Design a protein around this ligand. Sequence first.
Ligand SMILES: O=c1ccc2cccc(-n3nc([C@H]4CCCN(CCC5CCCCC5)C4)[nH]c3=O)c2[nH]1
Ligand SMILES: O=c1ccc2cccc(-n3nc([C@H]4CCCN(CCC5CCCCC5)C4)[nH]c3=O)c2[nH]1
Lengths: 268, 263
Amino acid sequence: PRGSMESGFTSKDTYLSHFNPRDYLEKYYKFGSRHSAESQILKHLLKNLFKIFCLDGVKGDLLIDIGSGPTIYQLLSACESFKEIVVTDYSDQNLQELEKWLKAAPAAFDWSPVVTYVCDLEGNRVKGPEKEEKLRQAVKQVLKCDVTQSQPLGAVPLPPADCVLSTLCLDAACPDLPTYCRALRNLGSLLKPGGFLVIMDALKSSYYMIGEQKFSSLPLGREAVEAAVKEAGYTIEWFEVISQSYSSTMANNEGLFSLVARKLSRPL
Amino acid sequence: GSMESGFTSKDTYLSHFNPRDYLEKYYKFGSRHSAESQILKHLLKNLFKIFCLDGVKGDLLIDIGSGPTIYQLLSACESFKEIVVTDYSDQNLQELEKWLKAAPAAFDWSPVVTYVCDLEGNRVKGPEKEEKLRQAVKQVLKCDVTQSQPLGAVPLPPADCVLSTLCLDAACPDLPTYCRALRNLGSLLKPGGFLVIMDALKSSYYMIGEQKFSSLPLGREAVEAAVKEAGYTIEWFEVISQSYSSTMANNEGLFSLVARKLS
Ligand SMILES: O=c1ccc2cccc(-n3nc([C@H]4CCCN(CCC5CCCCC5)C4)[nH]c3=O)c2[nH]1
Ligand SMILES: O=c1ccc2cccc(-n3nc([C@H]4CCCN(CCC5CCCCC5)C4)[nH]c3=O)c2[nH]1
């Protein structure tokens, strides 16, 4: 026939070549209103992260952020609770954009309003400059991750981490449910026994947009997520769903979830 | 300390390689007799000699590392009923597909199409030539020449010819991988099938505007030894002294070779 074959490309190929860090930041993290859907969701995620790392007992020596993207908002409360942080993504472009903020390059994104907000949550025991530096000192490594591989960070020499965080990544990274489950088990290989898994992601979202550019997403409901996490050797401590969805022009999600789980797996 | 990122050359390539910058900077074929135009002229004549005058012909040709370009196919569609185009970059194949579909955003190849029609004796005008290429190109696939099955587990019939222009140097970070890649491409070929390769000599990088990429700097002796070792018999091998502009690459000439898979 003609054009009757699979191109052979995968989601991660399309992601690596098409995903634009600076656009994603323009569209998802610059707000013309503070009551916009995107702004509301960001604030919610920040409050949960504050609760987990500051109020709940989630702290330690090493945190690994899986699928950081080009953002640092998901690390601002974490750097109070973790000596060292490792940031990762499948896109080197995302990591370059992130590194610009780490090195405080002038072209870096302006996170200062998000910083202010987190300083408020924490009760203004520091101002933004001091907090920003604490994060800059905390981040030690900038690495490729591939959650589909049994060794997501390669054969790199990393000690077992106290926490693996992943915000708005796993849905986009996994083309089917078996992959999702395997990925969660693969992330386990980075963790100490009894270590924390922290996940926030969209529910029932099959796509996300950056301008005219469309990306695939695995549309999971809460039951699928819970089942997959359990089956991958974690015990869920809590699981929150919010109804607040993204604008239809960005995603077709029916809310987001947040969970904190612990690795039961103790490979001898 | 500080660890390595983990990203490979093919990650970097897939991530950063911009089809349209490559087309702008390399294949404009403008008024100024640039080094890039002189090189393009030479490739076109060699391809014509190989496919039209010589007897490299058959049913199936697979182009490895097509990129966003069609210059390497213009003579080949006279000799082959079917052609498969491949690249590790989906961006490249998207730009190529724009041309194949005659979308208006497509690159203007007509100066190059004109040149080739001239070579071939003006048997046809450009539009008919372009239509003949469009009918010939059947599939658009990912390739990864570092894999023992470069086009995946797709059911493809054994090919009569494997073409690869300006690809393998860029695709392979070491000589062992280069040898293996030629071995891998062989899996696509019939015994006695043709392997056509054109690439830069002693080139360690290339520029796509502001973006720099790695390439394997190979001398002619390395290339010939690697091809023999990979299980081919070389019919002929040509070198030209003409290099790219310093602002684009640091090569000491190009090579063309035609080899056959050992029957
Ligand atoms: O480890 C892997 C392996 C394969 C792979 C394939 C595609 C994408 C990613 N992700 N995905 C991300 C993040 C980067 C930042 C943006 N999110 C997507 C955000 C949308 C927002 C709307 C709701 C759905 C999530 C994705 N980082 C990534 O590395 C992959 N990660
Ligand atoms: O099959 C593979 C597997 C891994 C891999 C990694 C990097 C690059 C490529 N190539 N390389 C190309 C072409 C696409 C079109 C541009 N040329 C580079 C052109 C320069 C010009 C100056 C002289 C050196 C070559 C490269 N297409 C590719 O797919 C790779 N191909």
